[PDB]
């Protein structure tokens with residue numbers, strides 16, 4: 238037993254991380270087969286970075302301007318192109334450590350592992366959720382751009398995120414691996430700001446089920462509620478509405494605990510209206526919303542990846 | 544910016560994980576050079592497990608009783624010996640992925656990354672602290688024994704933990720890689736229980752400094768306190784005493800924020816006596832004690848590992 242915010246093993250991604258330097262900018266790239274993917278703002282200079290025209294900037298570039306280093310070994314760039322907000326640098330060597338991978342775009346409410354990197358060297362790994370406002374609450378310093386987020390499904394790495402920037406509230410914004418931003422953000426220095434967030438209701442319920450599975454039961458009650466009456470209380474506390482599909486997705490966790498989804502909703506209602514009154518749930522004094530029903534089932538069952 | 548519970552990249556450890564099966568017991572082993580390390584209770588059967596004599600049990604074993612699988616490849620066991628509570632299985636192949644490593648034993652209050660594994664396959668990675676009572680609050684199911692905890696220092700993996708068992712409160716106990724248990728526990732089914740824990744005071748202060756670095760300042764005050772007067776309040780709330788060495792270790796974080804250690808202690812005092820009053824610190828409604836001053840400096844600066 239036990240319940241921890243758990244990332245996927247990072248090894249398959251570590252073998253893809255490289256350093257990309259152009260002019261005075263150094264950041265990370267993702268090396269898959271013979272292509273290195275990196276944020277296109279690597280072509281910028283600090284006076285380019287306020288209102289750049291990236292096509293203009295890229296046509297003035299040469300292959301040899303891009304210094305790509307995989308560990309202590311230089312990769313020769315033999316072609317370059319822009320795809321939305323990422324650059325694809327064609328190099329003369331296919332990465333022999335390329336895992337089976339996909340490029341997927343995730344939904345708000347979904348989680349993934351981030352491999353924080355600097356100078357092409359992995360620094361740390363942690364779990365993030367895509368917020369309803371398309372930001373992520375990460376940990377990113379200068380030089381971390383090009384770090385990727387991912388999930389692993391058996392032996393296959395589904396890359397879903399590349400880091401590009403920090404917003405003024407200290408949250409983070411980036412793209413999918415096709416270079417399309419999550420949310421209404423641009424790789425421009427503007428006055429852009431995150432925008433109002435909400436709490437991921439289905440995830441809170443999944444985490445409550447994780448708590449029950451692990452022996453935290455004090456918040457359970459005999460009450461119940463209708464989906465409609467629960468959703469009235471949801472909005473009120475700035476929680477996302479709960480759909481019948483969410484109820485369906487929680488079925489397995491309901492069947493394992495013997496607690497009907499709607500009964501767990503009644504528990505959540507009381508927690509929202511009363512607080513926790515000095516008590517904790519899975520070591521937290523807050524209702525946690527960054528675990529999906531999948532994350533709970535995986536960890537409270539023990540799936541692996543080879 | 545941002546602050547997240549961050550594990551080390553797990554790749555170097557993933558390459559060492561194997562499956563060890565003996566009789567009806569399957570667990571994980573750690574394969575370094577030509578030795579596989581695993582918990583000695585792999586030699587047990589469910590009727591052995593109440594009060595076993597492990598030397599007796601081991602002399603009745605044969606090399607061929609131990610099935611070791613590294614991925615889909617069987618490793619021939621050519622020797623075996625017991626070292627305290629771990630088994631060393633000598634195999635006919637040195638692990639070509641053996642990283643530079645050390646076997647270190649950590650102190651309570653210190654943190655490390657756990658690579659949860661099942662059937663020799665890594666499942667997830669997360670950060671744990673050694674509690675003052677020598678348990679860890681992990682996430683471990685049946686089959687997870689032999690998963691290891693570690694830190695990485697440049698390119699060197701310092702293994703500090705091997706998982707053996709869960710205690711009745713749902714916390715976890717294990718050994719260093721020399722097979723010596725952390726804390727007063729035995730790999731026997733008895734009525735053993737964790738024992739009273741305390742909060743790691745120096746770590747709470749480090750996390751407060753992490754908060755300030757990231758723009759949470761509401762808990763700061765103009766008051767100060769003496770080390771002695773702070774430690775009176777510490778005990779009271781079941782916090783560990785703060786030593787002058789702890790104050791010294793917090794010096795760099797004090798110098799970066801401009802907040803004297805003793806002033807941050809005065810802030811902690813008020814948080815202990817008043818609570819947080821609906822507010823959060825780094826997304827937590829509790830005072831977090833599983834980040835060391837090192838962890839804060841690493842993440843709020845950006846060290847990597849190659």
Ligand SMILES: *[C@H](O)[C@H](C[C@@H]1CCNC1=O)NC(=O)[C@@H]1[C@@H]2[C@H](CN1C(=O)OCc1ccccc1)C2(C)C
Nearest residue numbers: 278377378379380381382401402403424425426544
């Ligand atoms: C790429 O390594 C960097 C990552 C930032 C740096 C601080 N935290 C991060 O996540 N990305 C950027 O610097 C982007 C880039 C330039 C502005 N920018 C950005 O994040 O601005 C906000 C910021 C910068 C530095 C420190 C705090 C906040 C453009 C092209 C958007």
Ligand SMILES: *[C@H](O)[C@H](C[C@@H]1CCNC1=O)NC(=O)[C@@H]1[C@@H]2[C@H](CN1C(=O)OCc1ccccc1)C2(C)C
Nearest residue numbers: 238584683684685686687688707708709730731732
């Ligand atoms: C090894 O894979 C297993 C890991 C346990 C299983 C549940 N959570 C864990 O961390 N270790 C054991 O089963 C050890 C082993 C036998 C008893 N034991 C143990 O942990 O007992 C408590 C327990 C067991 C199963 C489920 C919940 C709690 C001995 C030799 C100590």
